[PDB]
Amino acid sequence: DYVSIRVSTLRGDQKIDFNAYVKINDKMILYLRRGDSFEGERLKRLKDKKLRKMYILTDEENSYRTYLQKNIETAYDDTTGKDIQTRADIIQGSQQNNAEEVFENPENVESYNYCKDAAGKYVNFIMSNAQALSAVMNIENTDKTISHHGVTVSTLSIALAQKLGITDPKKTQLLTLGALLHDYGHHHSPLNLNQPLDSMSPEDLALWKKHPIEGAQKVQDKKHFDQTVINIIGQHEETINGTGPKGLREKDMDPLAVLVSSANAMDRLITFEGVPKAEAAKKLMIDHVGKHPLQHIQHLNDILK
Ligand SMILES: [Fe+3]
Ligand SMILES: [Fe+3]
């Protein structure tokens, strides 16, 4: 009777041609009403509620799904000169959505290639628009979800990739996709990420240390998965002085996973540890001395401001 949708797919200024319900005590409350839109402070109010899921009437699906396609279509369109926060709203939420599919459907070959394909679209979107990054960085991770945090890391990762003069589209594409999915090993996990790793109980820290090794075990076996991606998923907590979980050093890694390992260190601070954007790079230079290419750290410092 009802079909669930992910909230990150409701973005931008197009008025909806369907109603959307949230579930309370097994009943479906009508929350979002026909003609509603989500541009501006609307998206914040919408995210202040920890709604991961909403629902639509099985006979309003086409309406919704048509809405979603037109949404992403026109958002990638570089021509329409539509507001950049607006386009960024739509695409960030869409990248976030694609990563959730793969996370819940990692064996689904077709989901993967959609995400991978979208990854490419995102790169071309980030490079080809000056505003993009600062606009995508406006959308907070209020929920603190690994899917949104993975969109954030991929974003830092692209900008970083550009500073380092990494240009191969197959590579920025594969880099982004693997940053997006980078935390799949946290998926369905008891661990509360919203704390600092120093303030972690040994029961948490040891549960945290397992996540790259486990996350990678769960996908190295699926032929449709690129190896760069498996590597990124498996290696992104590794640090150049080998203090990360597997204890790898720069020689042992995917170069692209070093680059992701740095872009992740930044957002764990900003998002999971409440360090203000401006001081994250500094925190790392001092309290995380040795763990990351200082050049990476420097560039990310620039990117932020
Ligand atoms: Fe991680
Ligand atoms: Fe992470």
Side-chain angles (χ1 to χ4, degrees):
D1 199 21
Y2 288 97
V3 67
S4 80
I5 72 186
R6 269 135 193 160
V7 166
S8 53
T9 62
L10 309 167
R11 296 297 182 87
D13 72 328
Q14 192 204 165
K15 299 181 176 31
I16 56 186
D17 186 28
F18 48 96
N19 295 284
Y21 310 81
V22 321
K23 189 206 272 168
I24 290 102
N25 280 32
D26 201 27
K27 323 244 80 179
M28 292 294 174
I29 278 46
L30 204 184
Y31 184 35
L32 297 166
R33 307 188 185 183
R34 216 159 269 130
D36 278 11
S37 58
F38 306 93
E39 71 288 350
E41 292 193 19
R42 296 174 172 82
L43 196 159
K44 194 204 188 312
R45 171 167 45 125
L46 183 52
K47 269 168 62 235
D48 285 340
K49 333 285 193 294
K50 167 29 158 279
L51 306 169
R52 284 287 303 262
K53 283 216 130 62
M54 299 187 64
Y55 300 88
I56 66 174
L57 295 161
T58 60
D59 46 45
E60 286 200 274
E61 189 168 21
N62 185 94
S63 180
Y64 156 67
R65 296 200 172 271
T66 277
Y67 158 95
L68 210 213
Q69 188 62 38
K70 173 172 175 177
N71 227 34
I72 72 178
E73 247 167 39
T74 74
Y76 285 118
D77 195 329
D78 264 308
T79 88
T80 80
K82 179 184 309 144
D83 183 21
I84 198 63
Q85 199 55 83
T86 301
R87 288 170 78 229
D89 285 352
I90 298 179
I91 302 170
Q92 187 281 329
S94 186
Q95 293 300 314
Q96 194 188 342
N97 183 41
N98 299 340
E100 268 143 1
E101 320 226 279
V102 177
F103 284 173
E104 286 167 31
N105 303 314
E107 68 282 349
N108 178 353
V109 158
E110 184 53 53
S111 255
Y112 186 105
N113 293 307
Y114 187 79
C115 190
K116 177 163 187 176
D117 188 320
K121 295 202 202 162
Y122 187 46
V123 174
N124 281 320
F125 166 76
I126 289 298
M127 307 288 196
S128 313
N129 296 273
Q131 307 280 66
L133 203 113
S134 35
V136 164
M137 296 300 294
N138 283 328
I139 318 157
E140 267 173 352
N141 195 0
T142 53
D143 269 17
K144 265 61 179 139
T145 57
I146 74 187
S147 77
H148 176 109
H149 152 84
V151 170
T152 292
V153 166
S154 101
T155 304
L156 298 188
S157 282
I158 285 162
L160 180 43
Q162 188 183 20
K163 303 276 192 188
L164 299 191
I166 295 196
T167 55
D168 201 275
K170 294 284 190 300
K171 263 186 156 222
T172 48
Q173 183 189 34
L174 266 186
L175 166 85
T176 306
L177 181 56
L180 233 198
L181 303 178
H182 94 258
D183 258 341
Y184 172 62
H186 274 329
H187 190 61
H188 296 334
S189 164
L191 182 59
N192 164 79
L193 313 174
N194 191 248
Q195 41 160 159
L197 322 180
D198 271 350
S199 313
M200 280 204 186
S201 76
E203 280 230 331
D204 287 321
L205 181 62
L207 180 55
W208 184 88
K209 290 179 164 176
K210 298 194 168 323
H211 91 269
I213 96 188
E214 296 194 13
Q217 283 174 358
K218 289 154 51 184
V219 303
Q220 57 196 10
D221 312 303
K222 303 168 181 32
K223 298 195 213 71
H224 56 304
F225 261 73
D226 305 275
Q227 182 66 56
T228 270
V229 179
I230 293 155
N231 284 337
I232 286 180
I233 294 167
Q235 295 177 336
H236 72 271
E237 296 298 338
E238 301 310 312
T239 57
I240 64 173
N241 69 141
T243 35
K246 304 169 144 305
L248 304 186
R249 281 171 190 271
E250 195 161 15
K251 60 154 168 159
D252 309 315
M253 291 183 57
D254 200 314
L256 297 174
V258 172
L259 188 166
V260 164
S261 177
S262 298
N264 176 71
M266 290 285 291
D267 191 48
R268 151 153 282 294
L269 288 195
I270 306 166
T271 280
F272 298 139
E273 312 207 350
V275 172
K277 277 178 192 181
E279 301 138 48
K282 191 166 165 187
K283 225 293 191 308
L284 281 168
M285 264 150 182
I286 297 140
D287 287 330
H288 298 247
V289 47
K291 300 179 192 289
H292 303 272
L294 172 60
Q295 190 55 266
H296 285 178
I297 302 312
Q298 281 296 352
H299 283 303
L300 282 164
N301 176 51
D302 295 341
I303 301 178
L304 284 201
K305 27 131 175 156

